[PDB]
């Protein structure tokens, strides 16, 4: 029993965190094999980079100084070729995630991991994270068996306190650029498929007060959801919720009729899984993994 | 900016997780140096759980009855002893990944990270607090027994909890690493229930100071309160009594924001009376109590917004 926001074990990622210093700027880097990946703002980026030599970049892995032997740029990410391969390099892939997908964040300062937390890529491409100055280069990841899938690298904080960053190939999530300008996060929406998954997790944990005898159509549900700034629910979302629907005996459009009633009437002093708000940072797969016991 | 429930990086603890099998039971163990620590109920059948005599069950076992697995490698048990509700298995190999560590017993209200495991394999990490009723609201399934709670302040791992059982309400009970249970619980399948839980007042206050640090003051008022009057109101909402120690502990956060502890206590009184009226505090519609004054100072900036 119990339902917590759970992050993946961070150990395989801790063994890759390094400190990168270029002049007066100090941020975090990801050391995989003989390459260190970090935000390019550590340094017209081609004009700034052409003026630098390998020794201008100071890379620290624990107490050991790594020697930079080459450097190149890929989108908004700087790739520093080092003389030593990381002996703690795990099996890994670079993956780009979609909004609504969740991931673990290992928050670092001066190449030292300080905390781990779980979060989701919002529909507006921002992440509601917890980062202070020096956190740049902290990474987001998922684990599938023994393989680490790197999906995010922190670049900046927006004026509303939310965060923006890139995939590990330097491509930003959202319409953001890596520089000081007037940029704001778009209006956010609720990840509907995630709220439904969390309602199924509540039923699995013995919370059924919100269930009713009604069912609805996908069209009618989307007309109501659009009015409460909820993401449209697609047929793919309904298919993805199939296993949870079969496990609890509550059809997806049966659970949508419960969500519609919670949206129009509220919770009325009651909570779901200890929460007074409808939770959207647990995907269908997270619910199945936390209520099954998948290990790494 | 931002305020998340943050767990400590789990790597130092992952390198200590092993699988312990005794007969038909399989649970998790903590391998530190040449000793593997695990719940003593690993020597029990489901039948034994009603009235188990652990001394009688243990005297009938030999070293080769305990199977310990560290990854793909089988560890050989060379000794065994019981310390309260934990079984200590002496192994022939010291753990090369043993970090710097201490065994610490925590008090209710204290927080810690939990590395949830099954078959000696870590599957997830989360942050939680020791409730005033000595239970933990965790997320554990069958096979999680032996999963551990810890803090990693500086480079040292402080082990404070080992999971032993789930109570009928879905909450969890366990011991410190010396086998002493937190709360009036026994590793016996007995009619035992968690006492009425209360809100950790000093933690809610700390979290209200964290909201003021991150720029939110809508909940503040012009009133103050005596400590006694605050506790008379707090007891009516099932909040833990706030002691003079709690007020002293909140000293640095009070000095950083310019809001006296008893003035923040007055805001808490008013929040309990009125609710949030459609507003949230740090993205929450409920008053949060699983962040200590020490966690707030650790996570939040030193400069107030
Ligand atoms: O199904 C049982 C059998 N349990 C009896 C029992 C009695 C005393 C002691 Cl110390 C341990 C135990 C085990 C125990 O409580 N294990 C577990 C731990 N953590 C989370 C769980 C989640 C689901 C199932 C078992 C869990 C086995 N009871 C549980 C109340 C559902
Ligand atoms: Cl303590």
UniProtKB/Swiss-Prot annotation, chain B:
<feature type="active site" description="For 3CL-PRO activity">
    <location>
        <position position="41"/>
    </location>
</feature>
<feature type="topological domain" description="Cytoplasmic">
    <location>
        <begin position="1"/>
        <end position="305"/>
    </location>
</feature>
<comment type="subunit">
    <text>3CL-PRO exists as monomer and homodimer. Only the homodimer shows catalytic activity. Interacts with host FBXO22; this interaction promotes the proteasomal degradation of nsp5.</text>
</comment>
<feature type="cross-link" description="Glycyl lysine isopeptide (Lys-Gly) (interchain with G-Cter in ubiquitin)">
    <location>
        <position position="5"/>
    </location>
</feature>
<feature type="cross-link" description="Glycyl lysine isopeptide (Lys-Gly) (interchain with G-Cter in ubiquitin)">
    <location>
        <position position="90"/>
    </location>
</feature>
<protein>
    <recommendedName>
        <fullName>3C-like proteinase nsp5</fullName>
    </recommendedName>
</protein>
<comment type="function">
    <text>Cleaves the C-terminus of replicase polyprotein at 11 sites. Recognizes substrates containing the core sequence [ILMVF]-Q-|-[SGACN]. Cleaves and inactivates human TRMT1, preventing tRNA guanine(26)-dimethylation of tRNAs. May cleave human NLRP1 in lung epithelial cells, thereby activating the NLRP1 inflammasome pathway. May cleave human GSDMD, triggering alternative GSDME-mediated epithelial cell death upon activation of the NLRP1 inflammasome, which may enhance the release interleukins 1B, 6, 16 and 18. Also able to bind an ADP-ribose-1''-phosphate (ADRP).</text>
</comment>
<feature type="domain" description="Peptidase C30">
    <location>
        <begin position="1"/>
        <end position="305"/>
    </location>
</feature>
<feature type="active site" description="Nucleophile; for 3CL-PRO activity">
    <location>
        <position position="145"/>
    </location>
</feature>
